[PDB]
Design a protein around this ligand. Structure first.
Ligand SMILES: *[C@@](C)(CO)[C@](*)(O)[C@H](Cc1ccccc1)NC(=O)[C@H](Cc1ccc(OC)cc1)NC(=O)[C@H](C)NC(=O)CN1CCOCC1
Ligand SMILES: *[C@@](C)(CO)[C@](*)(O)[C@H](Cc1ccccc1)NC(=O)[C@H](Cc1ccc(OC)cc1)NC(=O)[C@H](C)NC(=O)CN1CCOCC1
Lengths: 220, 244, 216, 233, 202, 213, 204, 238
């Protein structure tokens, strides 16, 4: 992976690539790494994919249960605490590196959560194997209280640097923009990589495979 | 206080007028037992208990109703002595747990609250019965001053300047209201505690009695101690002299 | 404790005519670093018995808390019974072996000193539960340096006066400072007597360094 | 309706008292302790000629040197006898010696008041045992006879009877028993007293007889063995 | 890390660097290692980021309830005792070097050290973390009995700057906190504000 | 990690006669290359008729002795009699086997009188394997004491010597001589030799000094 | 390799309004082949199939435990299971064994009840869902199966075009793998019929 | 009448009948006496024959080298409680290698006997004990009840017709301290004598003596061992 988050003027931008790997082979060219926690909080995930999915779903479930009881919009601190205290309890065996971001009644908040259960609160965070490349862009180009379109450009460039430089990262750039009154889940925000068109034809024609046995079962 | 077709058989059962009779009957146990008093002076707390001797065959010091809960905390009991000792053990353990966790002597008001919560827990269920015991707790500190608390079978905890529990509790409290304890030294209080006990004691109906005395204050360097024989015997001489 | 952290080095003890004297420097070493230069490694148990501990200081602080409470619990009853030095020694053997057998040892080596009913007590306790009595005791490097000197004197003179025992310890603490690299020239002297237990403030051993000039 | 651990105003436990009453319904048993050994006798009380008398065992061996006769609710004794058997073998395993008659009796007696309702295990006893036991054995202290009841009280007896007719049997022993009689006299006396109190006619099938002596192990008397002693009218 | 706490008359002065390392990469160049536990009680965290954090959060919960129940402003010693219990019981599982410093109306300014073993000792000043190794000599040579609050602020800032200079696993920004009866006051030193001791060679 | 064992040296010896039993041990307690104490007799009395000697890891020896004493009273309370030497030996076997997978680093030798007043000796291994024999050595020096005893008490390997019954005097001299011989070669053995003698009337103790080096 | 102990190779492919699923037929312990007619593709309800590659035990164990929950689901609910719902059930099953996983990587292919829409996905040994619009593979010849599918697969294939593609892909990928082969079975799923075929293949 | 079924039910008078009925068991049991001097503590117990052809039931039991007990009430409850006392004594010697102080053991009984008197479906210990002991504080005579209350005694007697034994000990309590071991036992069994009806007196069959003190450990004297004490039979007047 490459996942990154930014705090801008109006709220939060979250970014992620779409590459999943098994060994040194690409398993999924288009996987969703920005996860729903609540209608106002989203969470990026890196590391062990299955750990990423289940940890992000359990906390999302637990917050809905919480927000139904309170009748209030859930807080990014609660998402932070829930994720932190779990990942710590499992001594880092749940391999989930997280970029948590959302907008509260308190305002815009961004967190980075480590598999061992250590959290940081920062204006810009990067996680994943492409984090160094993404963090380099932020250190060079980040400015305080920037505009939405400008922050969208920044995060996408950070993800791009992770894609074109980290072998564990590739394919599409995903974005999630969260403000006080709006949420944009931009799935394919940018498609910087495409498969070359097959100008040679290898379509195996009908009757080119030898069959030994055939059974046809009809249905409703 | 009457209806008892149920209602009064379990502590988990309210009476139609909203009372827990099992707690009230547990309070009757302390009402039948002999009187115990404690007075908060300017520089400490003094305890006094009328210990009724059932037989002259018992040693002087048997059935001691004065207890050391912590090196700085004293305990005077009234009611069912079996429950009293087990409540002292609970108080002992609560006081030692505090030192083992926080490194200092447990503040009396916190110890009193903790123990009272335990007392209260025995008033809610059919599985257990309330303690038939009222107890007082006394302590003195240079930072907190003199402190005196009393806990009844229900689990209620209050701070006192003077307090009486037992057979003649109402009779004793009228004698303590005569004293200016806030200005008195705990050396003078011993004399007055002994007097109140002797007055309240029933000469004809109850037999002979032993007077038990303890104190904690400036005079005893903050440690809860039994009042020395020479000072105790002086107060007994004085208390009998008050009976003119 | 699997790995000790802040540790104390040698603890010494020798009984004399009248009571027992125990010595220990006031250092808590963190490996080769001398981190805590002002810590007490001797505790008063009760009026008749005291304790000095080698090894992990955090574990010593635990035992100090547990024994501390035990003595308090006895003095509550006021029945006229109190733990003898031999009793505390017995209890400590039971505690240390129990933890050893749980494969979670208290990383300590104790010296118990006491005076009760005319005779003076001196006992040793391992982190494994090895316990015995001896007229002189030394832990850590003290075993290799101080104890030899302590035994040599007791060979010539089995019974010592308080002064003779005290200045012997002075001599032993001087050698330890020369030769042990985890020691410190700031120690406490603890003494059990008929009067009770006294621990004395910061003490330094006078050192000689004349041998510097005679190399050539 | 009360709990099983409720005291009567006299200072006894209802369930324990009623468990003693159950013995008064059981078949009568006699044990006699003599210098030459211990003998145990019990009536079988057969209700149908179709029932096999050999299957009714009221006298059982615990070890080679200890026998036990029982009266009352026979079904209850199953556990008590088994626990006694396990105790004797555990002792041999640990100490390489045989348990004394007193020790076994005491071990079983510890189980008597192990009953209750609240604060119980996943299989604790709900009520006392409705049986009385006679332990006859031989150890270093010679031959002894012990009697246990549902209350847990165990005591050495020179001669004791337990059962429905233990009233007349005990007073009959206080006439015949001499503290220096032989084992042959003891067996003779017990069988005589047994036939005095039994409803059915005494023969070599409706009774059970066993002896333990310093010379030889626990011996169960067969039909022929019984005929030899029954013949004395 | 480097962490430091100095006790003065009316309270305490706390100081820490701002570097969080994951190997040889600074994961967070501006970290608040000074954690508030109560109104006047702080702790300095060194060692495992997740370990120290979890302990801190548990002590905050434990002391919070304790204070309300006791109805007193919490003792610094008490907060240090809650750290000790946890750091000692789980000494084999945690990597935590804590310094607890604060104020209470009973004993005033206090500095307690809880190293990796789980021992507890009160000190005039305490230093911890990997960077504290390089400043033992300076701290022993500079420290004076009875320093004023403003001098203690200078003293901590100087020691930390020297430690961040040499130690690789320390650096970034000096964070200072002063706690006295009146409350807590915080300040941050950036670039030029860090006491410069010039590169001293030929 | 951490070793829960220490070798503390020490050797125990026992000889069974007709009306007596001798349990002897050196008094040195060691660790590594240094001596803990010169006064540590390993032989310990249990009843009027039984004496035990423990060598090896002293931590276990102390614990095991404290377990046996407790168990002796437990037996006494339940069975209303003192435990016999054979019963103590049989019990110790079960106590040692209870720790089969965490062994007591311990060599026990029991000496005393049997139920007919004759001398009895029982030898043990760390895990409880035991038997009755006439003489046995156990400990750091057991390999040195044994061959001489097998020759002198057991009359083995000699051609024509009529097996003369053991006397108390000859057995006492034999005990003293083997330990003196052991102190010459084994580093763990020395200082002083403690001897326990079990007979009809109580238990007697005798002490002979040994090499201190 | 733990996965290479039994070998195996499982593949799924999307057509127009159809979906194909193929597998190898060898059951072997390391070098030795044992059975030639070993089942790896399992029916989960008319137009829904799961293919399991990996350790032969867990290949069986998961199928048997998945069918357990499927039957309870289909009885409690008054409906057949949806392809997305089964995927989540597998992910749940496999993640319950997070720190002691079943050594199998499932491949699901089927048509959506009512809307008869094609669906394909693959999963982890710890149950991470991965949906695609072209193909999914799992097995010891993971790499070989990818090379074929990336070069043969076409966007909109009819049932017969789809059959020929998955057949060639499974067949030629297997031929470069030592522990995979001994025949290939193919299931093609249409709205009205299912076509099961075994291909003519190398047996070495 | 509806409050006497459980220990957890308080009566309107502030009493617990189940604890009070349990105390009746002590009265129903055979009488026993316990007295102390400055050096020795003596227990004298009267044994009962269930049907004088069986042996007289045991009354005095061992606890430790310095503590022994006399029982009154339920035997099975007596043994259960005795095992507890034996266990706490063995624990003390294991850990501290010193004899457990009598007073401390008695207060451990006071806590253990309390627990059941406050839980539902439980019952009090239907036994009263007379504890004789010797420690650093000298000889001790202690009394326990079904109510977890315990007493420190100069002299004590419990059981059937123990009132007459109590009045003898009342009369002669001023003589116990400076008096010697041989006279102590005489005073003990002379009190036990007073419980017996005027027809039957003390014999080698029905008397048990337990002695613990300065020089000797706790020893039980039963049959032929009891005759040296009976030799000196002062004879009974009334
Ligand atoms: C980038 C791609 C890693 O270079 C991301 O961290 C990414 C996160 C992601 C991807 C898809 C969906 C959600 C989030 N991580 C992966 O793609 C991940 C890489 C990885 C493999 C092995 C690991 O060792 C513990 C850690 C990370 N890929 C997977 O999880 C793959 C699909 N599954 C496996 O490799 C199976 N593992 C899981 C852990 O236990 C051993 C077997
Ligand atoms: C200085 C920088 C280094 O000693 C400090 O001690 C600092 C403490 C700190 C950090 C953040 C907030 C408050 C205080 N320590 C670290 O930054 C710490 C270094 C460390 C790593 C592992 C340790 O073993 C348990 C001990 C110290 N870094 C971290 O905790 C980072 C965030 N996490 C990781 O390095 C992940 N680790 C966890 C252990 O296993 C290997 C991967």
């Amino acid at each position: 992976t490459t996942i990154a988050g930014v705090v801008y003027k109006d709220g939060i931008v979250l970014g992620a690539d779409t590459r999943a790997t098994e060994g040194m082979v690409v398993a999924d060219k288009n996987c969703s790494k920005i996860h729903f926690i609540s209608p106002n909080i989203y969470c990026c995930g890196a590391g062990t994919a299955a750990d990423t999915d289940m940890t992000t779903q359990l906390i999302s479930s637990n917050l809905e249960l919480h927000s139904l009881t309170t009748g209030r919009l859930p807080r990014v601190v609660t998402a932070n605490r829930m994720l932190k205290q779990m990942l710590f309890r499992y001594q880092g065996y749940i391999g989930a590196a997280l970029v948590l971001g959302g907008v509260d009644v308190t305002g815009p908040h961004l967190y980075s959560i480590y598999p061992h259960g250590s959290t940081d609160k920062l204006p810009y965070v990067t996680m994943g194997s492409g984090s160094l490349a993404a963090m380099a862009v932020f250190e060079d180009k980040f400015r305080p209280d920037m505009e939405e379109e400008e922050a969208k450009k920044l995060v996408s460039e950070a993800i791009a640097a992770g894609i074109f430089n980290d072998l564990g990262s590739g394919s599409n750039i995903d974005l999630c923009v969260i403000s006080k009154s709006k949420l944009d889940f931009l799935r394919p925000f940018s498609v910087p990589n495409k498969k070359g068109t097959r100008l040679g034809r290898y379509r195996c024609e009908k009757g080119t495979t030898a069959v030994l046995t055939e059974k046809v079962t009809p249905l409703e | 206080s009457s209806i008892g077709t149920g209602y009064d058989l379990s502590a988990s059962t309210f009476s139609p007028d909203g009372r827990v009779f099992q707690v009230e009957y547990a309070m009757k146990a302390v009402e039948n037992s002999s009187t115990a008093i404690g007075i908060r002076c300017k520089d400490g707390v003094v305890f006094g208990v009328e210990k009724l001797v059932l037989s002259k065959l018992y040693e002087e010091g048997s059935n001691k109703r004065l207890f050391n809960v912590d090196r700085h905390v004293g305990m005077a009991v009234a009611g069912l002595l079996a429950d009293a000792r087990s409540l002292a053990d609970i108080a002992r353990e609560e006081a030692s747990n505090f030192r083992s966790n926080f490194g200092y002597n447990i503040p009396l008001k916190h110890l009193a609250d903790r123990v009272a919560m335990y007392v209260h827990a025995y008033t809610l269920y059919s599985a257990v019965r309330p303690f038939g015991c009222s107890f007082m707790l006394g302590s003195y500190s240079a930072n907190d001053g003199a402190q005196l608390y009393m806990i009844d079978p229900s689990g209620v905890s209050y701070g006192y300047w003077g307090c009486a529990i037992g057979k003649a509790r109402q009779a004793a409290k009228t004698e303590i209201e005569k004293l200016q304890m806030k200005e008195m030294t705990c050396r003078d209080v011993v004399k007055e505690v002994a007097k109140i006990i002797y007055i309240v004691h029933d000469e004809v109906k109850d037999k002979a009695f032993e007077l038990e005395l303890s104190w904690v204050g400036e005079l005893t360097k903050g440690r809860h101690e039994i009042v020395p024989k020479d000072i105790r015997e002086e107060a007994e001489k004085y208390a009998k002299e008050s009976l003119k | 404790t699997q790995n000790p952290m802040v540790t104390g080095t040698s603890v010494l003890g020798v009984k004399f005519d009248g009571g027992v004297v125990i010595a220990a420097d006031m250092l808590g070493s963190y490996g080769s670093l001398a981190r805590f230069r002002n810590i007490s490694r001797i505790m008063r148990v009760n009026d008749s018995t005291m304790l000095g501990a080698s090894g992990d200081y955090a574990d010593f602080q635990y035992l100090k808390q547990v024994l501390g409470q035990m003595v308090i619990d006895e003095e509550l009853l006021g029945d006229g019974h109190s733990y003898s030095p031999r009793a505390i020694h017995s209890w400590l053997t039971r505690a240390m072996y129990s933890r050893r057998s749980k494969m979670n040892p208290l990383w300590n080596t104790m010296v118990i000193g006491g005076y009760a009913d005319g005779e003076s007590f001196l006992g040793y306790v391992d982190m494994l539960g090895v316990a015995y009595e001896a007229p002189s005791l030394a832990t850590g490097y003290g075993a290799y340096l101080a104890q030899p000197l302590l035994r040599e004197v007791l060979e010539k003179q089995p019974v010592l006066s308080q002064t003779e025992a005290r200045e012997l310890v002075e001599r032993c603490m001087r050698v330890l400072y020369y030769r042990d690299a985890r020691s410190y020239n700031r120690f406490q002297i603890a003494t059990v007597t008929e009067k009770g237990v006294e621990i004395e403030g910061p003490l330094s051993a006078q050192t000689n360094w004349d041998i510097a000039h005679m190399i050539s | 309706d009360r709990g099983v651990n409720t005291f009567s105003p006299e200072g006894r436990l209802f369930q324990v008292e009623y468990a003693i009453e159950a013995i008064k319904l059981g078949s009568t048993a006699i044990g006699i302790q003599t210098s030459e050994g211990v003998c145990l006798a019990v009536e079988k009380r057969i209700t149908s000629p179709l029932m096999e008398p050999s299957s009714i065992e009221k006298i059982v061996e615990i070890d080679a040197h200890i026998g036990c006769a029982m009266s009352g609710l026979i079904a209850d004794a199953k556990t008590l006898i088994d626990k006694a058997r396990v105790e004797t073998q555990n002792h041999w395993f640990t100490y390489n010696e045989t348990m004394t008659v007193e020790s076994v009796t005491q071990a079983v007696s510890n189980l008597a008041l192990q009953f209750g309702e609240e604060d119980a295990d996943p299989g604790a006893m709900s009520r006392p045992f409705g049986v009385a036991l006679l332990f006859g054995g031989v150890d270093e202290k010679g031959p002894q006879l012990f009697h246990m009841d549902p209350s847990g009280t165990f005591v050495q007896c020179d001669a004791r009877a337990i059962g429905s007719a233990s009233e007349g049997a005990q007073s009959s022993l206080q006439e015949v028993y001499h503290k220096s009689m032989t084992l042959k006299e003891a067996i003779k006396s017990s069988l005589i007293i047994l036939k005095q109190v039994m409803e059915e006619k005494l023969n070599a099938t409706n009774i059970e007889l066993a002896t333990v002596q310093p010379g030889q192990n626990f011996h169960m008397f067969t039909k022929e063995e019984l005929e030899e002693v029954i013949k004395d009218i | 890390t480097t962490i430091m706490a100095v006790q003065f008359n009316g309270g305490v002065v706390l100081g820490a660097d701002s570097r969080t390392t994951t190997g040889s990469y600074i994961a967070n160049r501006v970290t608040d290692k000074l954690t508030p536990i109560h109104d006047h009680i702080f702790c300095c965290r060194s060692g495992s980021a997740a370990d120290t954090q979890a302990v801190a959060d548990a002590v905050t919960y434990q002391l919070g309830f304790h204070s309300i129940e006791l109805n007193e402003p919490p003792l610094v010693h008490t907060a240090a005792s809650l750290f000790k219990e946890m750091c000692y019981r789980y000494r084999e599982d945690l990597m935590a070097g804590i310094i607890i410093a604060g104020w209470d109306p009973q004993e005033g300014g206090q500095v307690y050290s809880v190293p990796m073993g789980g021992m507890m000792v009160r000190q005039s000043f305490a230093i911890g973390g990997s960077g504290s190794s390089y400043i033992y000599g300076y701290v022993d040579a500079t420290y004076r009995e009875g320093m004023t609050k403003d001098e203690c602020l200078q003293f901590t800032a100087n020691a930390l700057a020297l430690a961040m200079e040499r130690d690789g696993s320390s650096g970034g920004v000096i964070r200072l906190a002063a706690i006295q009866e009146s409350g807590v006051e915080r300040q941050v030193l950036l670039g030029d504000q860090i006491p410069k001791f010039t590169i001293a060679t030929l | 990690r951490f070793s829960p064992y220490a070798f503390n040296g020490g050797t125990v010896l026992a000889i069974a006669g007709e009306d007596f039993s001798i349990v002897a041990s050196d008094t040195r307690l060691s660790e590594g290359f240094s001596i803990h104490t010169r006064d540590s007799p390993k032989c310990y009395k249990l009843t009027d008729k039984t004496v035990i000697g423990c060598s090896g890891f002293h931590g276990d020896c102390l614990t095991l002795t404290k377990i046996i004493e407790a168990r002796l009273k437990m037996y006494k309370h339940s069975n209303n009699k003192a435990m016999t030497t054979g019963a103590i030996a049989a019990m110790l076997s079960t106590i040692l086997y209870s720790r089969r997978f965490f062994p007591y680093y311990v060599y026990n030798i029991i000496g005393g009188l049997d139920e007919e007043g004759k001398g009895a000796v029982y030898s043990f291994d760390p895990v409880g394997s035991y038997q009755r024999d006439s003489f046995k050595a156990g400990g750091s020096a057991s390999a040195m004491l044994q061959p001489l005893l097998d020759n002198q008490v057991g009359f083995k390997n000699m051609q024509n010597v009529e097996h003369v019954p053991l006397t108390l005097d000859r057995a006492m001299r034999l005990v003293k001589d083997v330990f003196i011989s052991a102190a010459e070669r084994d580093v763990y053995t020395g200082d002083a030799l403690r001897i326990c003698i079990v007979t009809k009337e109580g238990i007697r103790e005798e002490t002979v000094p040994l090499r201190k080096d | 390799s733990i996965m290479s102990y039994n070998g195996g190779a499982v593949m799924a492919m999307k057509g127009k309004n159809c979906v194909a699923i193929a597998a190898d037929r060898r059951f072997g312990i390391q070098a030795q082949m044992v059975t030639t007619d070993f089942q790896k593709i399992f029916p989960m309800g008319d137009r829904l199939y799961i293919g399991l590659a990996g350790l032969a035990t867990d290949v069986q164990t998961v199928a048997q435990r998945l069918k357990f929950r499927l039957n309870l689901y289909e009885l409690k609910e008054g409906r057949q299971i949806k392809p997305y719902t089964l995927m989540s059930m597998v992910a749940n099953l496999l993640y319950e064994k997070r720190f002691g996983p079943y050594y199998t990587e499932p491949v699901i292919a089927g048509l959506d009840p009512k809307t008869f829409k094609p669906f394909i996905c693959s999963l982890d040994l710890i149950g991470c869902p991965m949906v695609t619009d072209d193909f999914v593979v799992s097995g010891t010849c993971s790499e070989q199966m990818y090379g074929m599918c990336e070069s043969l697969w076409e966007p909109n294939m009819d049932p017969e075009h789809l059959f020929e593609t998955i057949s060639q892909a499974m067949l030629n990928a297997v031929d470069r793998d030592a522990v995979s082969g001994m025949g290939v079975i193919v299931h093609v799923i249409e709205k009205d019929k299912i076509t099961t075929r075994t291909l003519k293949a190398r047996m070495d | 009448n509806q409050y006497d079924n459980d220990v957890t039910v308080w009566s309107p008078q502030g009493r617990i009948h189940q604890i009070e009925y349990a105390m009746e068991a002590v009265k129903q049991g055979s009488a026993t006496v316990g007295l102390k001097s400055k050096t020795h503590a003596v227990l004298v117990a009267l044994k009962r024959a269930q049907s004088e052809l069986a042996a007289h039931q045991k009354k005095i039991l061992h606890v430790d080298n310095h503590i022994g007990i006399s029982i009154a009430g339920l035997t099975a409850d007596a043994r259960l409680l005795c095992n507890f006392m034996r266990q706490e004594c063995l624990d003390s010697r294991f850990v501290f290698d010193r004899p457990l102080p009598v007073s401390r053991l008695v207060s451990l009984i006071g806590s253990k006997t309390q627990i059941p008197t406050q839980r539902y479906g439980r019952r009090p210990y239907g036994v009263g004990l007379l504890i004789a002991g010797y420690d650093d504080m000298g000889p001790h005579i202690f009394q326990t009840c079904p109510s977890a209350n315990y007493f420190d005694c100069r002299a004590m007697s419990i059981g059937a017709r123990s009132q007459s034994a109590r009045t003898y000990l009342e009369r002669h309590m001023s003589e116990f301290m400076e008096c010697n071991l041989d006279e102590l036992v005489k005073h003990g069994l002379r009190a036990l004598r007073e419980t017996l009806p005027a027809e039957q007196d003390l014999t080698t069959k029905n008397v048990s003596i337990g002695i613990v003190g300065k020089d000797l450990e706790f020893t039980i004297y039963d049959d032929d061992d009891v005759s040296p004490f009976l030799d000196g039979l002062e004879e009974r007047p009334q």
